[PDB]
């Protein structure tokens, strides 16, 4: 019936580290969004700017899906007008965000015993990110007056940090997989669509 490839985003074997978050465009497919907001397998499911029960009745130009992995705490920050390490240095939604933030516990996949170190987040940066900007830089962060010259040291940090997920932690420290649906409404009179 030409259904949208939602499974490809949600059920991928591996997700991207939040500093290098992955982005997929959905197009040329009929999408039933209810099969997402009626699933209780998503522990958190947040919508801004739009009414979820009216998503199948709206007209979009663009539809983006950003996937990545963070920890339970930081899901707070995937929202308009939030602060903190993730919202400031990794992934920021603008205040006029119109879309939805879906996140679910991925303890049994992304947390191994002794730590899973493949998931990194950016821990130092000289300035905050603009909304929907991603940085994948590896430049050394100068925290002191002594210049760095690209050499890591006590005052010159590597800018990224592993999570080191372990399944025994509490839920706030446990890995959560996140998908952000971003929408682009069609400009039209209301007799046409909205």
């Amino acid at each position, epitope marked *: 019936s030409n259904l949208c490839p939602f499974g490809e985003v949600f059920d991928a074997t591996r997700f991207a580290s939040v500093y290098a978050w992955n982005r997929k465009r959905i197009s040329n497919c009929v999408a039933d969004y209810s099969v997402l907001y*009626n699933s*209780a397998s998503f522990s*958190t499911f*947040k*919508c801004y700017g739009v009414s979820p029960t009216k998503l199948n009745d709206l007209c979009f130009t663009n539809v983006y899906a950003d996937s990545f992995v963070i920890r*339970g705490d930081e899901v707070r920050q995937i929202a308009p007008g939030q602060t903190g390490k993730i919202a400031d240095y990794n992934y920021k939604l603008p205040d006029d965000f119109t879309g939805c933030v879906i*996140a679910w516990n991925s303890n049994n996949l992304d947390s191994k015993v002794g730590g899973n170190y493949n998931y990194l987040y950016r821990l130092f940066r000289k300035s905050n990110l603009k909304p929907f900007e991603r940085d994948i830089s590896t430049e050394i962060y100068q925290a002191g007056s002594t210049p760095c010259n690209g050499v890591e040291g006590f005052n010159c940090y590597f800018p990224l940090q592993s999570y080191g997920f372990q399944p025994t932690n*509490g839920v706030g420290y446990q890995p959560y997989r996140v998908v952000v649906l971003s929408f682009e409404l069609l400009h039209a009179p209301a007799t046409v669509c909205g």
Partner: nanobody
Amino acid sequence: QVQLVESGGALVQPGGSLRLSCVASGFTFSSFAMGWYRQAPGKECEWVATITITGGSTNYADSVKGRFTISRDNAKNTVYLQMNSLKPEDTAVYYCNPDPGCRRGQGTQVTVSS
């Protein structure tokens, strides 16, 4: 900003029932999916129950499957957790949150003791 006020918790005897509640403010409730979590002294915060935006589907944790029920009233910005056949192991501070974690709101204390 955001406010999450839980309530309803008291000391019940084993086997008993309890209906916990919380009221949310600071965001369009009708449009968020809500979860319940619990934190026990000397233990870590764990997830208890999840309910969809519409309340149509519900997911529960294996330690409470069959004994607990999560519900939602959008007209009152309130979510409810009915707790049946309470074990002493369910004694913890209970929190409600659209995001993961405990301690966001003040929570409410539930003590199952005989």
